Nucleic acid binder design. Structure first.
Lengths: 80, 50, 225, 178, 38, 135
RNA sequence: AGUGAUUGGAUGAUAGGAAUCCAAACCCCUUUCAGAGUAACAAUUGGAGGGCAAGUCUGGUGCCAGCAGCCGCGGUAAUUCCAGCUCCAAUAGCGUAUAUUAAAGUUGUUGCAGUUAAAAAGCUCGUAGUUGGAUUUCUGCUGGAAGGCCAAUUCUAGCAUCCUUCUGGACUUUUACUUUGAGAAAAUUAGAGUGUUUCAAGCAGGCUUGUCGCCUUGAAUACUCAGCAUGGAAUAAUAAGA
RNA sequence: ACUUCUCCUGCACCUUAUGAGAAACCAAAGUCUUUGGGUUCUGGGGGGAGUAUGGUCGCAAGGCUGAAACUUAAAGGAAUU
């Protein structure tokens, strides 16, 4: 949301749910943000991670986990 | 409604009430000069009896 | 007045002054449970500007039980600071002033940010509902439409106030259904404004950054009591 | 029968009684020294001609030959009338006008702005009592509205006591009486 | 008319089945009386 | 639902002109019975002579005797009862005195406290307000 | 910054001239002798329970008289009647009655509703009427004229096997559709220009000791289903099937 | 004949919805102010009235079509105490 020349007007940007790509509003208290930690060789290790967020619209279906598998198959660390 | 309601009492309270004259007072301003007074006395309920 | 003892993770963080402003809370979508959190951000003079509260309506409610009737008063209160922040709250109580206290507390707790747009050309601070946004509550459809600048607000007097407390300068209201019930009408108007951020434009097609939460970054403070 | 056009300069609002409306109108009477609520609704109506003209034009397209003609004619009026300042000539700016912009441009204020009148009310009385030369000839009417080249020009009429003429009638009665 | 509601009986009423019959007897009578004056 | 298709002008146009008559206010305008009905001739005001002075009682809850007048319109000689506004003024009417009749402001129907749709605006052309005021 | 009749000195309403106007009077515009201090040259019209802005005031009346568009006031303490005082709204205007438009997404093409609120024919056939599946020269490269802006967007010729009878029109089934164009009275309506003192208006004006006065003066322009004409590759009818 | 498993086609049933509704409830009453797949019929506050008159079908009983004057501020729906 720009105007005239630069200056991103408005306050903040709503997070976009990974599973549906649909924006999470202010008062969705059923929203989630997972952190999943990486590992080095013979790890061990955390602190570097893949963040991922999903809305309460997706969760109350029961389709949270099936989509969250897809979002960490493409990263590498599952093999479904 | 019934037609035979009597017309004797018509003009009871207009005739009953005690007459009294209006007091002589100094005239209010009119037009623009009235809207001057109404502007000032608000910004420096409106009718508050004892 | 007064030094409240913060309860919960959010309460502790705000008093210390770690979280900067409420857009950080609204991003990660965290429930503000005490009103003392939101009292902190809108400080007098400092707030620019302080939150303003107006009492929309007072309605006597009666329950017929046994001998006699018991009447309680339900107080609708909207509250907002012009510049995108608005809220809407209700409470009932046996006396009138005791309802309005708790109604203002509930109004602050249900405080929601409102994005705002330009109607065609886009110069010099936004002034409108950014698209045609509907809201419903209990057989009261309300539809807010962008208007050109200087249009002002077109709607019911009740409509003018709680769009006024958002900061929306221009509108075209429609209103189907029984607008006589002001309890439903305010909720219908309010839940329209709540959905403004929820609606996805081509301006927000870019994939998100994912910053750390205020719960994450100030975890080590929240270890100790 | 007679071929003479005529129109209404103003129209009353839909709600008679609103405390939001009546307060904000009463300020405009108090600032600029007006007779009645018709004088506000006149300017309310006069803006909405200009505003609805721009609202029609602005929807189209900047390269459209209707907008480039009719827009530039409308912007010339706002520059001439001293209503929009010349630094911004965008049609968009016309929308951001208010009633206070029009009511600062009328001759009640521009006397007072000039400062000869002293007080808003006095300035209306000076206008109606045949003082104040605007340009070449004197002007009797509060709701004149000045065209910005003319504004420097307002001065007391050559005739009259402020101007340098016969001192009305009451000063003569004192002077010849003594 | 009345159509479907016809017999809603939302509040204390005569009862539709009886009402229809009462009007039929009034109507039937109207016929013979109007044919008598021919 | 409706027929949407481009060539469905007849069905759309016919349905309005038929089902416009389902309105109550449309029938009061557009039927021929408006001209026979009313004692007025589709008119604002009408003169008449006061055949009799009459009194009627308001339906409960309100109770009282309202003081109205029976009048015959000059054009049709149709009797009507016209209410007399304000305190007294009954004395003012005088049987056989011409009185202007005006609508009660409810488009017939009825007013408040039974079956009266008219008000006497003037008596002998004097008018009610002037006398009650005494101005 | 507002009050306080405490005094205080500083323009036309009016009445009569002058010239101007007028066919002859008259009005306007000019300038004139008189011409306001409770500025007696005195602003009224509807309201003050809610809707609707504005009095839990003070007397009289006691479901009476009356108010009241609707809800409702009055049965002896009336926030509504009849008065007084104060305040509110509009203001040289304001109230009432009838018809009409918006509000009326309460006639709904845009745009309503039909389980229970008003309303799905008891059920099938069925002629008009309305509506009807997919599919038939798509892609590519090289120009040309323009083109906005610090190459995009238009339009157009070729070459992948592309007519010709001539020197612009004939053929491409036929229309609808869309585009541009013709022709269609003004007044009114929107609208360009212009200080009728402003303004509703009007179509005038504006420069200037120059005299065949000048601005080769202005009074633009839009708008006005069916019908006539035309560029076009989709969509939809329709035709057919050497 | 029975067991296990898949396919369409029936009458339904249970569970649940960031789908809908005034609510009761609803795999349709969903995909409708983010309003247009095609089409038939019906309704416009409550009475007066499915009455009056005229028409037409019927052997009759009655059916189909179907008004007005006047009347009235509420009738009506779903849940709560």
């Amino acid at each position: 949301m720009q105007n005239d020349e630069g200056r991103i007007v408005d306050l903040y940007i709503p997070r976009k749910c990974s599973a549906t790509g649909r924006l999470i509003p202010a008062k969705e208290h059923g929203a989630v943000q997972i952190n999943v930690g990486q590992v080095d060789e013979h790890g061990r290790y955390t602190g570097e991670y893949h963040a991922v967020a999903i809305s309460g619209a997706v969760r109350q279906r029961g389709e949270s986990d099936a989509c969250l598998n897809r979002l960490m198959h493409e990263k590498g660390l599952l093999s479904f | 409604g019934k037609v035979h309601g009597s017309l004797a009492r018509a003009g009871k309270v207009k005739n009953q009430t005690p007459k009294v004259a209006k007091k002589e007072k100094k005239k209010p301003p009119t037009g623009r000069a009235k809207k001057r007074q109404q502007f000032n006395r608000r910004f420096t309920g409106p009718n508050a009896q004892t | 007045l007064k030094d409240w003892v913060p309860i919960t993770k959010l309460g502790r963080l705000v008093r210390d002054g770690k979280i900067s402003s409420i857009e950080e809370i609204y991003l990660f979508s965290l429930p503000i449970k005490e009103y003392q959190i939101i009292d902190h951000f809108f400080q007098p003079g400092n707030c620019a500007a302080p939150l303003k509260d107006d009492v929309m309506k007072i309605m006597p409610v009666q329950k017929q039980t046994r001998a006699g009737q018991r009447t309680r008063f339900k107080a609708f209160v909207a509250v907002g600071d012009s510049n995108g922040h608005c809220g809407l709250g209700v409470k009932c109580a046996k006396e009138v002033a005791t309802a309005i206290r708790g109604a203002i507390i509930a109004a602050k707790l249900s405080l929601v940010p409102v994005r705002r747009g330009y109607w065609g050309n886009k110069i010099g601070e936004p002034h409108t509902v950014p698209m045609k946004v509907s809201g419903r509550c209990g057989s009261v459809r309300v539809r807010l439409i962008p208007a050109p600048r200087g249009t002002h607000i077109v709607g019911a007097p009740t409509t003018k106030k709680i769009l006024g407390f958002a900061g929306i300068k221009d509108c075209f209201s429609n209103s189907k259904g029984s607008t006589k019930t002001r309890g439903n009408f305010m909720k219908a108007l309010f839940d329209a404004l709540s959905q403004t951020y929820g609606y996805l434009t081509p301006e927000l097609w870019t994939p998100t950054v994912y910053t750390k939460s205020p719960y994450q970054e100030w975890s080590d403070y929240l270890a100790r009591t | 029968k007679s071929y003479r056009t005529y129109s209404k300069t103003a129209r009353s609002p839909k709600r008679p009684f609103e405390k939001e409306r009546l307060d904000q109108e009463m300020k405009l009477l108090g600032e600029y020294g007006l007779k009645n609520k018709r004088e506000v609704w006149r300017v309310q109506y006069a803006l909405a001609k200009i505003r609805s003209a721009a609202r029609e034009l602005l929807t189209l397209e900047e390269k459209d030959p209707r907008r480039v003609f009719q827009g530039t004619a409308l912007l010339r009026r706002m520059v001439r009338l001293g209503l929009l300042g010349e630094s911004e000539q965008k049609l968009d700016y016309v929308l951001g006008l208010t009633v206070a912009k029009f009511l600062e441009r009328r001759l009640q204020t521009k006397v007072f702005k000039l400062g000869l009148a002293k007080s808003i009310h006095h300035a209306r009385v000076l206008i109606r009592q045949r003082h104040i030369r605007v340009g070449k000839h004197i002007v009797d009417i509060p709701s004149f509205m000045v065209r910005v080249d003319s504004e420097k020009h307002v001065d007391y009429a050559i005739t009259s006591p402020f101007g340098g003429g016969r001192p009305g009638r009451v000063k003569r009665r004192s002077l010849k009486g003594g | 008319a009345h159509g479907a509601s016809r017999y809603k009986k939302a509040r204390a009423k005569m009862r539709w089945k009886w009402k229809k019959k009462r009007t039929r007897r009034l109507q039937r009578k109207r016929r013979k009386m109007r044919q008598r004056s021919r | 639902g409706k027929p949407n298709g481009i060539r469905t002008a007849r069905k759309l146009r016919s349905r309005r002109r038929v089902q416009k008559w389902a309105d109550k206010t449309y029938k009061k305008a557009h039927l021929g019975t408006r001209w026979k009905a009313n004692p007025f001739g589709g008119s604002s005001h009408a003169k008449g002579i006061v055949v009799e002075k009459l009194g009627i009682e308001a339906k409960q809850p309100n109770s009282a005797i309202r003081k109205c007048v029976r009048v015959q319109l000059i054009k049709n000689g149709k009797k009507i009862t016209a209410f007399v506004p304000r305190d007294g003024s009954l004395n003012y009417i005088d049987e056989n005195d011409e009185v202007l009749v005006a609508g009660f402001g409810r488009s017939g129907h009825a007013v408040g406290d039974p079956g009266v749709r008219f008000k006497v605006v003037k008596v002998a052309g004097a008018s009610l307000l002037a006398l009650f005021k005494e101005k």
